[PDB]
Amino acid sequence: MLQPKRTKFRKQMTGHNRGLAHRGSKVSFGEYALKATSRGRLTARQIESARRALTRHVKRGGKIWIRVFPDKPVTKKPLEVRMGKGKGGVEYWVAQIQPGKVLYEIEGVSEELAREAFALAAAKLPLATSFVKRTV
Amino acid sequence: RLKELYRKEIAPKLKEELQLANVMEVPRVTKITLNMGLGEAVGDKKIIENAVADLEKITGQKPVVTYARKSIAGFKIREGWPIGVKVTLRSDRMYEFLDRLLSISLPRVRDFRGLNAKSFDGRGNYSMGVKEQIIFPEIDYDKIDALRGLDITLTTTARTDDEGRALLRAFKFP
Amino acid sequence: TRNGRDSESKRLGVKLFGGQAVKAGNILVRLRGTKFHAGYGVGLGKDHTLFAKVDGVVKFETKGAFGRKYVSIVAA
Amino acid sequence: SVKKETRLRRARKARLKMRELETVRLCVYRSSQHIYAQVIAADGGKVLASASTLDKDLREGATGNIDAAKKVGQLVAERAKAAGVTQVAFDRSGFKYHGRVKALADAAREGGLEF
Amino acid sequence: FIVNAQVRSDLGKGASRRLRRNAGLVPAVVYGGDKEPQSVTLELREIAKLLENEAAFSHVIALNVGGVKETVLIKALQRHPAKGFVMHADFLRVVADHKLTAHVPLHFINEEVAVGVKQAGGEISHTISEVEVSCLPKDLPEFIEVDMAKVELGQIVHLSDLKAPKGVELVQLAHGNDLAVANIHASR
Amino acid sequence: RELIRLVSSAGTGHFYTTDKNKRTKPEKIEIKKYDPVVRQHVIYKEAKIK
RNA sequence: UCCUAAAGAGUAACGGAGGAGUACGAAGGUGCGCUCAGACCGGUCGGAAAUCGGUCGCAGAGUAUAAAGGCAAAAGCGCG
RNA sequence: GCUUGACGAUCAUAGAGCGUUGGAACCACCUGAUCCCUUCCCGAACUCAGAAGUGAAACGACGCAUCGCCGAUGGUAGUGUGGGGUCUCCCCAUGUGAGAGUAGGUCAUCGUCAAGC
């Protein structure tokens, strides 16, 4: 799916996900957008699954922007493995998202079809999202 | 020469040929290196100074034997340590410098056209060839196989392109 | 492919902060390469340790070009 | 310039050493025209007095030579005997120690002005 | 366009945060000119009905605190990132003889009759709306028209190809950064 | 780098001590340093550790 | 040596990243001399690139060695 | 008194970029190396006999505000303490409080010293 092509380090910490998305919150490239209203994580096959629901529902045209990008490595321990024998290996990638972050954007589409497209997209996402328009 | 040809001819007219205001935006010619391509078969350390034995007798001056920057593992091997040769002749040797080729010895070997038309890279062009290391006064037929090279263009020593063309020439030789 | 082996944590930093009385031998900044520079009466040791060469109080000015953070001691 | 900064690229260490150290300074000037001198005392920023080669006694015409550099060695020295130091320190100031630079200098040693 | 406003003689984090949840107000300021900035409180119910209008930002909007009235401009409104309501409206004044930079929205009128839409199959690509201008206040436009009745499949209309009220300086043409305003592109 | 020794040319060994690459320069050193005892500087010869 | 480490020190883990078990008689002192790299280009053997000649340069270079922190009053080279 | 020198206070509100100039004093060249020497070969380096020449280049002050650079107010994020909640997070009281962004200054402000007008 969506990875960085390289990374400086193979592992990050766990970290936290605090604050609001004061950046990433405006519809910067399209006319309509799926903005998240709750915080969470998107495991890069939630990214692609909602992307495939969008492009398939429009069926004629329009340009679609993917504003989110999974950049941090997430590491699991396998089974039959005791705690603490070094940090486990990377499995997937995750974008840390805040309330207010624009996830997807679209143009060239009617306002009734964009709501029907981002409702297909939001059902494949573990977030509480919303539909927004371009403001100014 | 720095004489009747230089002092009383090249000086006073060049101000109003270009509609210039005052005196010393006349250019001057100072420097070009040998840059004899030492970097081939350079790990010798006995016949780089064959180009010292080449450069001494005909140009009258001791070379610097110039070490480069790199360990350039693609162009050559850096074990052949000094790959530059450079000399500055004098303004009091500009007499015989103007008078050693393009006065007596312009046929280095031959040119089938010396047209001063096919290079408008705006840095004061000319068209003449001097690259053989054999064409120079006071040389025998063969006591050294001293085959080397010598690379002559010129650039600007002034503001624009037009400043050099009547200045590079002194006589009516193409 | 194996991690461990951190070092033993050299205790660097600004000792004897910027209003304090000094005596004329005091180590004034332990330092890993002159993050602070030498003002009026301070010394600049070999490992870039700043040391008071006279008595007084330490000032911590910012001065000059290059944005040097200086440590100078004023005999006050 | 290519000339004025490359000597102030060389005039760098003693510039700022004698303000750290607070001792005497001899801010001279040489050129193809002239050879000057002017002295600053033991604090980095105090002018003593001035003495040019535009001084009243030797504007005779061969001004600023190595002949006319030894005339300057006892010249600002009398102007620094109202100052009160025996030794005096040497601004190289990007002026390479081969010509009028030392001939103002070494004529001060006989001229009551020690180094 | 008229806004009612009040005095707002108490400032801070927890004060401004309790106007929004108890009183239902928004904080604001007017500051512009060579004059004194003034803190202003204002109602969220009426500032959202002004932002309903298509020409909210590129239009002279009247405002009164009491009997005092000003030719006011909306300069850099602030917004809740999550729920999208207005907090801190942040107005300007108008001194009627300087250049008064603002944002002006775009129209893109002739999109049905386009040689890259009709004959050759292509769709439009809005890259930029709401260009930021600098214009004297009587020549403060609501709109800037963008004509796309001759753009072909592959042709790019820039801001160099743009237009009207002629007394309106575009800020991006003042520098070498010429911006691409729309496209017609082949479909996916 | 193997350890050397710098002796005086008398019946006195003050013996400042250091090391060098003898795998580069197989001869000795005749560079001369300060002496506390004899108080003249002297030809500081080979180690000769045996 | 950096991170974790919470803007003074310090601070754990079979936590995340790398290194050392030396070099140097000059690679030190000093005296003296002296300042990068980059794109831009000139093809008869190198033509992405050298020899370097000179034009816009805007530490991005270099530091014996890991990383951090530092530098021009150089904290790189030449030579006595 | 101003022109300009000569090291310094202050350090990109002082910085770069686009015209006019100064010749007398200063300043760069220039004429050349004889007598000092400078050369990894050289008097453009630099050492100088100099003052035959020259004010454009060279630099210098002196022009002009696009750009860098400073930058409110107000808000916001954070946060010490005390208390809540639906507690991987926020809210309330209270104290504090950015960063980024938002009209625009400006071809800076100083200090001693001197030859000349």
Side-chain angles (χ1 to χ4, degrees), chain A, chain B residues 2-34 37 39 41-44 46-69 73-74 80-101 103-107 109 111-114 116-117 119-120 122-129 131-132 134-135 137-147 149-170 174, chain C, chain D, chain E residues 1-50 52 55-129 131-147 149 151 153-176 178-187, chain F residues 1-22 24-29 31-50:
Chain A
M1 296 76 169
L2 262 289
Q3 302 179 357
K5 62 175 69 175
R6 53 98 68 204
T7 58
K8 192 188 289 183
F9 296 101
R10 297 180 71 247
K11 291 175 174 62
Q12 290 189 1
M13 298 308 201
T14 301
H16 290 282
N17 192 4
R18 296 185 181 94
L20 297 171
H22 297 94
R23 290 297 191 94
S25 61
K26 285 94 175 68
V27 183
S28 292
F29 301 101
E31 188 71 27
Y32 306 108
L34 185 65
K35 187 172 79 175
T37 61
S38 68
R39 65 185 67 253
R41 301 176 82 183
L42 284 83
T43 181
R45 64 181 62 194
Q46 295 165 359
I47 299 294
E48 178 62 30
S49 177
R51 201 272 301 160
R52 281 196 289 264
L54 286 171
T55 63
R56 194 177 299 166
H57 190 271
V58 293
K59 290 182 177 67
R60 180 63 187 87
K63 192 171 177 68
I64 299 173
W65 290 272
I66 315 299
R67 290 287 303 278
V68 288
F69 181 72
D71 57 358
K72 70 177 290 182
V74 181
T75 61
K76 307 293 107 168
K77 293 287 181 67
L79 281 78
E80 294 290 329
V81 170
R82 299 294 172 94
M83 300 302 296
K85 297 296 289 188
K87 188 172 183 178
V90 65
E91 282 285 326
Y92 52 86
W93 297 89
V94 152
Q96 294 283 102
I97 69 102
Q98 283 80 17
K101 188 173 181 63
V102 173
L103 307 173
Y104 302 99
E105 293 183 0
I106 197 163
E107 72 175 0
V109 173
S110 179
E111 199 274 336
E112 295 291 323
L113 198 276
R115 297 180 71 94
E116 290 179 351
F118 293 121
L120 266 295
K124 278 90 171 67
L125 294 176
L127 306 173
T129 64
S130 69
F131 183 78
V132 297
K133 302 183 181 71
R134 177 172 289 275
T135 60
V136 67
Chain B
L2 288 306
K3 298 302 287 184
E4 190 184 8
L5 187 66
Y6 170 76
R7 175 72 272 173
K8 294 187 263 76
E9 177 176 356
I10 307 171
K13 304 294 291 295
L14 193 272
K15 189 191 289 182
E16 283 84 6
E17 294 181 353
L18 215 280
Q19 206 276 125
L20 295 169
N22 44 6
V23 179
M24 206 179 284
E25 54 260 15
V26 176
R28 83 285 180 275
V29 53
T30 53
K31 190 73 187 74
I32 188 170
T33 185
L34 269 289
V42 69
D44 53 3
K46 290 184 177 69
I47 54 171
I48 299 301
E49 284 80 6
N50 195 1
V52 171
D54 190 5
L55 196 275
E56 179 66 29
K57 189 175 180 67
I58 58 174
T59 64
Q61 191 170 1
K62 183 182 184 293
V64 297
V65 52
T66 299
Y67 173 64
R69 191 266 300 168
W81 184 265
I83 65 171
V85 167
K86 195 192 293 183
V87 279
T88 305
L89 270 73
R90 303 283 84 79
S91 299
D92 204 0
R93 286 197 297 268
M94 184 62 208
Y95 294 90
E96 69 97 20
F97 184 71
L98 186 147
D99 290 327
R100 204 262 304 277
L101 278 84
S103 67
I104 187 71
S105 180
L106 188 146
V109 279
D111 52 349
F112 64 96
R113 189 178 294 274
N116 205 167
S119 65
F120 185 65
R123 309 299 293 162
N125 59 359
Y126 191 71
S127 65
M128 187 271 174
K131 278 87 180 67
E132 190 180 5
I134 309 298
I135 183 65
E138 290 178 352
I139 194 66
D140 200 357
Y141 182 77
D142 190 3
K143 58 172 72 175
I144 309 102
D145 290 331
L147 181 61
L150 178 266
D151 295 329
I152 300 299
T153 63
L154 217 280
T155 326
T156 312
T157 65
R159 50 183 64 250
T160 60
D161 58 354
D162 53 357
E163 303 293 329
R165 290 179 175 90
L167 200 282
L168 190 147
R169 66 188 71 189
Chain C
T1 311
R2 180 70 266 173
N3 302 122
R5 62 198 186 276
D6 193 2
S7 65
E8 287 286 327
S9 180
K10 298 293 181 290
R11 272 75 167 170
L12 297 170
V14 176
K15 291 94 178 69
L16 195 69
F17 282 92
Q20 303 185 10
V22 304
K23 295 292 177 67
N26 290 332
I27 285 170
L28 187 55
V29 178
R30 284 286 190 182
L31 191 55
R32 193 51 63 208
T34 186
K35 184 194 292 292
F36 296 96
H37 282 83
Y40 182 77
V42 317
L44 193 62
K46 179 169 72 176
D47 60 351
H48 305 87
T49 297
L50 294 180
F51 64 96
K53 292 189 286 187
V54 77
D55 299 341
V57 295
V58 42
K59 190 163 181 63
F60 276 104
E61 295 184 358
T62 301
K63 189 196 260 80
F66 308 102
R68 308 285 182 85
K69 298 183 180 70
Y70 273 103
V71 182
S72 67
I73 54 177
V74 288
Chain D
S1 302
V2 74
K3 181 69 176 179
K4 190 179 174 67
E5 295 297 326
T6 59
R7 66 102 161 177
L8 287 171
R9 186 169 65 237
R10 294 187 299 274
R12 287 190 186 276
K13 181 177 281 289
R15 168 189 173 184
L16 201 59
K17 182 67 177 177
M18 290 183 284
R19 191 170 181 85
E20 174 183 357
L21 195 71
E22 298 169 348
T23 326
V24 197
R25 193 165 72 249
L26 185 80
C27 288
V28 301
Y29 189 80
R30 73 104 197 274
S31 63
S32 68
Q33 299 294 112
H34 291 177
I35 174 68
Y36 289 168
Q38 184 262 319
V39 185
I40 286 94
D43 59 349
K46 184 258 185 183
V47 51
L48 276 70
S50 294
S52 302
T53 195
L54 304 177
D55 187 75
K56 277 80 177 175
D57 55 355
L58 283 173
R59 300 181 75 180
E60 57 95 20
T63 295
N65 291 114
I66 201 169
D67 188 3
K70 301 189 269 80
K71 72 172 187 61
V72 199
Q74 69 273 19
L75 187 138
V76 77
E78 180 182 0
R79 275 67 174 257
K81 286 180 173 63
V85 66
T86 61
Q87 68 184 358
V88 65
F90 188 86
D91 273 335
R92 183 169 74 95
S93 291
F95 298 151
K96 187 257 182 68
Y97 190 84
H98 189 271
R100 285 96 55 177
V101 49
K102 64 99 175 180
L104 161 60
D106 291 329
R109 290 174 177 172
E110 179 177 357
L113 189 61
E114 191 181 3
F115 283 160
Chain E
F1 289 168
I2 176 63
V3 198
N4 292 320
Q6 289 295 322
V7 181
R8 187 171 174 261
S9 178
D10 190 74
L11 305 169
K13 183 167 184 174
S16 301
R17 192 173 288 186
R18 85 187 77 189
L19 266 66
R20 295 179 179 96
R21 76 178 191 272
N22 298 328
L25 297 175
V26 300
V29 287
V30 293
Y31 49 83
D34 295 330
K35 288 172 64 176
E36 181 68 27
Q38 185 177 5
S39 64
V40 161
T41 183
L42 195 148
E43 285 81 5
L44 183 56
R45 185 181 63 246
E46 65 176 0
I47 199 66
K49 189 184 284 187
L50 288 166
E52 187 76 26
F57 302 104
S58 62
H59 192 273
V60 175
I61 180 158
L63 186 146
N64 49 358
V65 176
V68 288
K69 288 180 178 289
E70 292 86 8
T71 48
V72 154
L73 186 66
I74 304 173
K75 181 74 176 175
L77 182 145
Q78 191 166 358
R79 195 74 71 94
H80 195 210
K83 295 180 176 66
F85 58 91
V86 172
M87 53 188 69
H88 196 268
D90 194 78
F91 299 98
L92 273 171
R93 277 79 169 270
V94 171
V95 175
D97 52 354
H98 70 276
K99 287 185 180 295
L100 191 66
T101 179
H103 291 86
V104 175
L106 275 64
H107 275 179
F108 299 94
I109 42 170
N110 294 114
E111 289 174 345
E112 294 86 359
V113 182
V115 302
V117 173
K118 286 277 98 176
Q119 296 86 16
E123 295 182 359
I124 54 173
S125 179
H126 295 90
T127 68
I128 286 164
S129 298
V131 297
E132 51 102 18
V133 303
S134 68
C135 60
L136 196 64
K138 65 181 183 292
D139 195 356
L140 173 57
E142 292 179 352
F143 293 134
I144 291 173
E145 303 293 326
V146 178
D147 192 3
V151 182
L153 194 148
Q155 184 70 44
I156 302 100
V157 51
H158 294 91
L159 286 173
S160 65
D161 197 73
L162 195 136
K163 279 179 258 73
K166 66 188 71 62
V168 174
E169 292 291 327
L170 269 301
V171 174
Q172 299 297 320
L173 278 308
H175 305 92
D178 190 4
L179 275 58
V181 65
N183 293 318
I184 280 90
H185 63 284
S187 297
Chain F
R1 297 179 67 85
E2 55 185 355
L3 279 71
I4 63 168
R5 166 176 282 160
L6 303 176
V7 196
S8 176
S9 294
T12 58
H14 171 67
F15 149 59
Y16 281 164
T17 182
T18 179
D19 55 356
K20 69 182 289 183
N21 274 320
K22 292 185 73 177
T24 297
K25 44 196 75 174
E27 62 270 16
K28 305 171 188 63
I29 295 175
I31 298 169
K32 305 189 291 185
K33 293 185 175 291
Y34 166 73
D35 193 358
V37 181
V38 186
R39 295 183 286 115
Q40 285 183 356
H41 308 88
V42 71
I43 301 99
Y44 281 112
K45 284 287 183 69
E46 197 184 9
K48 204 272 296 292
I49 56 171
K50 290 293 185 183

